Amino acid sequence: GSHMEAVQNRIVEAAERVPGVRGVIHLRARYVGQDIWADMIIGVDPENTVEQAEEICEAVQAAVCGKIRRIESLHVSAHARE
Amino acid sequence: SHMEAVQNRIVEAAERVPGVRGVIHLRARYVGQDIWADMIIGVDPENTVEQAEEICEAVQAAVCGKIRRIESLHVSAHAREIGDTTKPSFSDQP
Numbered sequence A: 001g002s003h004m005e006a007v008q009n010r011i012v013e014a015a016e017r018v019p020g021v022r023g024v025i026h027l028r029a030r031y032v033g034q035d036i037w038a039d040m041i042i043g044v045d046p047e048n049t050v051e052q053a054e055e056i057c058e059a060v061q062a063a064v065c066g067k068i069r070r071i072e073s074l075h076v077s078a079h080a081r082e
Numbered sequence B: 001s002h003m004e005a006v007q008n009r010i011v012e013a014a015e016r017v018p019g020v021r022g023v024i025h026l027r028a029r030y031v032g033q034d035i036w037a038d039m040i041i042g043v044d045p046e047n048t049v050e051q052a053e054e055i056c057e058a059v060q061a062a063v064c065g066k067i068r069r070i071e072s073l074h075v076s077a078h079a080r081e082i083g084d085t086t087k088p089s090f091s092d093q094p
C-alpha cells in the first residue's frame, strides 16, 4: 500500500545518492514477517570494470541498509546504463 | 535430487564458454518436462560491465543450445579471482 511505496521511495532516494549510480532500474521489495527483503538493480557506467561495479553495489547496500532498519536482506546488482 | 546429470551438463556447457571463470551458482527446476534456470557465472574482475553482459548472453546461447529441455535461463556474473576453486552451488538464493 501507501506504506510500502514510502519505504520504496526511501530505498530509491538512498541508493541514488551513492556515487556511481545512474538511477535505480528495478526494485522488488516484500515483507517477510515484519522484515523487508529486497532485490535491486542499479544502472552504472558501461565502461566500469566488474570489480568497480561491485564496489558501487556494496556501497548502495550499506547506504540503504543503514537508513532503512527494517530491511533484513538486500541484493544489489548493476546493469550498464546511459 | 535425481537430476544431477542435467546440472552437470549445464555446468560443463557454461564453463566451456570463453570469459567464464566457473559457475558460482545454479538454481534449476523442472516445470513439466521443461527446465527453468537461474545461473551466476564468475568473470574477470577487470572485464567491463558491457563485456560481462556479452559473456552472459554467450552462456545463455551455449547452455540453451546444448540442453534443449531448458525453456528459460537467466544468467548474471560476479567477479571471480583466477585462484578460486569454489565448487558450484545449487541452492535456492545466496
Ligand SMILES: [Cl-]
Pocket: B016
Ligand atoms: Cl564447443
